[PDB]
Amino acid sequence: SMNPPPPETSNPNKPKRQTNQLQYLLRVVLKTLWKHQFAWPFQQPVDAVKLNLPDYYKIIKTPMDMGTIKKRLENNYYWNAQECIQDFNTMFTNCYIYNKPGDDIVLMAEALEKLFLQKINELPTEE
Ligand SMILES: O=C1CCCN1c1cccc(NS(=O)(=O)c2cccc(F)c2)c1
């Protein structure tokens, strides 16, 4: 029932870069999803205490949220686009694992994921 430390967003000895694809993931992908009417449950780590989800972090062992992704992008935490793409996919998958079909939160994730997929389809080639 207690909350874990959030995923890290800073790690000085981790290798990191700026790439044009990572710039796109911030300026286009993250910004598109962040402004969406259904973004709010995903804009910070799941607070299992406030939301009364005592089993959440017993089930979800790789938590991820857009708050974390946003900070990672702003802090240039990533080495490549695939790392960031994986974080988004982890976020969506967690939602589908924990919840059941047709739940409001799943409909919300599905809407965000559709947009995500549309934007990642237009990911620029590197350099
Ligand atoms: O699985 C995840 C990923 C992010 C949040 N989340 C989740 C899952 C179950 C319940 C709740 N609690 S809630 O108040 O934020 C809530 C309730 C009903 C609908 C809705 F959209 C939002 C949140």
Q: For ligand 1, what atom is nearest to the CA of residue 108?
A: 21
- Atom 10 of ligand 1, nearest CA residue: 51
Nearest to 31 by CA among 116, 125, 95: 116
Centre of ligand 1 to C-alpha 59, Å, is 15
The one-character DSSP state at 127 is -
Are 42 and 104 contacting, i.e. CB atoms less than 8 angstroms apart? no
Residue spans of the domains in the chain: they are 19-123
The CATH superfamily label for domain 19-123 reads Bromodomain-like (1.20.920.10)
